[PDB]
Amino acid sequence: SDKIIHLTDDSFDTDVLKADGAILVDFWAEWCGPCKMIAPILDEIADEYQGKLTVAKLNIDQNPGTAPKYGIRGIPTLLLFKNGEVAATKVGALSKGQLKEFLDANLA
């Protein structure tokens, strides 16, 4: 999480819903192995897209309410919030290339 924003339900309002720019919100949980697998990828992405994409992580174990709120199907769940509006989303993990493509395609 070297360059990742750890969100909470409480902070979600101001940090995501009242955001400006592109925020990639990765919903995760300690037990959800693949979240840990993508974590370094998300950090690399965060570094690569510094100032272009705000990479964020949201711990659902601590913040369950977010899952129902965003009809989360299963974690890891990446929600790409442009100014509080979900521009795109991804259920499950991604490879670095595909993730870069996905993000780039949204950022445009």
Assign 101 to helix, strand or coil. Answer: helix
Taking residue 76's Cβ as centre, other Cβ atoms within 10 Å add up to 25
Q: Which residue, 107, 103, 89, 106, is CA-closest to 27?
A: 89
- Specify the fold of 1-108: Glutaredoxin (3.40.30)
Locus of tokens 């996905």: 102
Q: Is the peptide bond before 64 cis (omega within 30 degrees of 0)?
A: no
Assign 16 to helix, strand or coil. Answer: helix
Q: In the PDB record, what is the listed experimental method? A: NMR
Q: Which residue, 70, 54, 52, 77, is CA-closest to 9?
A: 70
Task: Retrieve residue 26's tokens.
Answer: 């990765």
Q: Which of 35, 58, 79, 94 is catalytic?
A: 35
32 is catalytic: yes
35 is catalytic: yes
| Cα dihedral 94, 17, 49, 103 sign | positive
**Length of the chain in terms of residues written:** 108
- The set of long-range contacts for 81-89, using a CB threshold of 8 Å and a minimum separation of 24, is 81/16, 81/19, 81/22, 81/23, 81/24, 81/25, 82/21, 82/22, 82/23, 82/106, 83/19, 83/20, 83/21, 84/16, 84/17, 84/18, 84/19, 87/22
Alpha carbons 13 and 47: distance in angstroms, whole number: 25
Q: Which of 4, 32, 39, 93 is catalytic?
A: 32
Q: Which residue, 67, 56, 61, is CA-closest to 91?
A: 67
Domain parsing of the chain, residue ranges: 1-108
